[PDB]
Design a protein around this ligand. Structure first.
Ligand SMILES: Nc1nc2c(ncn2[C@@H]2O[C@H](COP(=O)(O)OP(=O)(O)O)[C@@H](O)[C@H]2O)c(=O)[nH]1
Ligand SMILES: [Cl-]
Ligand SMILES: [Mg+2]
Ligand SMILES: [Mg+2]
Length: 298
């Protein structure tokens, strides 16, 4: 699958006059994006037509805001090339180098190395969350309202074809969402996809870089702890997130956990909604199945 590499080479050279592509390979991808390593130096992140028709616009505005206002040794993407349209968007920045944090690597770190990493993370988040965001005040994200809208989308599309069990899982979520107070806390600029696969380590196992601020915005402070608190094979574990919360300070840990638990409870619904919005039946099917699996866990 080389048609897309060649296509991307052409597009890069076409949209960015005087950029020459000597080498190009795919080095990663997201749900709707592919990331290309170009000349062993640049990342070119690309998306074709999607629901976020101004998505890379926002992401770029965020990198610009952060590179202007953050004071940190931690690297983030600094945008040098951009092309943005309904049908195609491209962000180009110098590759952030290092090794992605994994549970395996963490477990080979000394206790001190682990603490320092935790400190590095706490300190970064503290700095970002503390930025006055009045300048990008429009990049607000209201997760509660979004779920409400997504629920309405469900009601308008497939809800009536759902089973009672599926419906009950959804309504039960909605009821919990209506009762929770976890949205009524501090709002601030968050990375909002803060998992260990976006965290880069240098050769001393210290945090050297953070990527993918594609979902960032002004949102509940709790958001950036959701994956740090996650107990799964992909993430490091709850104790890791707890310790980081303590280092970060001034934050209700139980509430951060409740927030994580609610996001986790929503995931199958999110999956279904993605399936609907992007016309991908496989995602609707997986989300529904996942509801059954969780209903039967107990
Ligand atoms: N090492 C490294 N990998 C990157 C960099 N930028 C992107 N990637 C890889 O490309 C993937 C997709 O980038 P990302 O912004 O996460 O895409 P999104 O998940 O679609 O928003 C990431 O998960 C990484 O694997 C970078 O600057 N350094
Ligand atoms: Cl289905
Ligand atoms: Mg990503
Ligand atoms: Mg992203």
């Amino acid at each position: 699958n080389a048609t897309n590499v060649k296509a991307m080479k052409y597009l890069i050279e076409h949209y960015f006059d005087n950029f020459k592509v000597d080498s190009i390979e795919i080095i990663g991808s997201g749900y709707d994006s592919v990331a290309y390593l170009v000349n062993n130096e640049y990342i070119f992140k690309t998306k074709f037509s999607t629901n976020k028709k101004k998505g890379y616009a926002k992401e770029k505005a965020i990198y610009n805001f952060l590179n202007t206002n953050l004071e940190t040794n931690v690297k983030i993407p600094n945008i040098e090339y951009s092309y943005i349209s309904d049908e195609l968007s491209i962000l180009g920045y110098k590759e952030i180098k290092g090794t992605f944090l994994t549970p395996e690597i963490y477990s080979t770190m000394s206790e001190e190395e682990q603490n320092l990493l935790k400190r590095d993370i706490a300190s970064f988040l503290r700095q970002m969350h503390g930025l006055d965001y009045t300048d990008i005040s429009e990049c607000t994200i209201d997760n509660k309202q979004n779920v409400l809208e997504e629920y309405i989308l469900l009601r308008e599309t497939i809800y009536n074809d759902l089973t009672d069990i599926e419906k009950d899982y959804i309504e039960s979520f909605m009821e919990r969402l209506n009762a929770t107070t976890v949205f009524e806390g501090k709002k601030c600029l968050c990375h909002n996809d803060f998992s260990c696969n976006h965290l880069l380590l240098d050769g001393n196992n210290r945090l050297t870089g953070i990527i993918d601020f594609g979902d960032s915005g002004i949102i509940d402070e709790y958001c950036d702890f959701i994956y740090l608190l996650e107990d799964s094979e992909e993430e490091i574990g709850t104790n890791f997130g707890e310790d980081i919360l303590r280092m970060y300070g001034n934050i209700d840990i139980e509430k951060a956990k409740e927030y994580q638990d609610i996001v986790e409870e929503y995931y199958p619904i999110e999956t279904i909604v993605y399936g609907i919005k992007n016309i991908k039946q496989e995602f609707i099917e997986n989300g529904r199945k996942e509801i059954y699996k969780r209903t039967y866990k107990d």
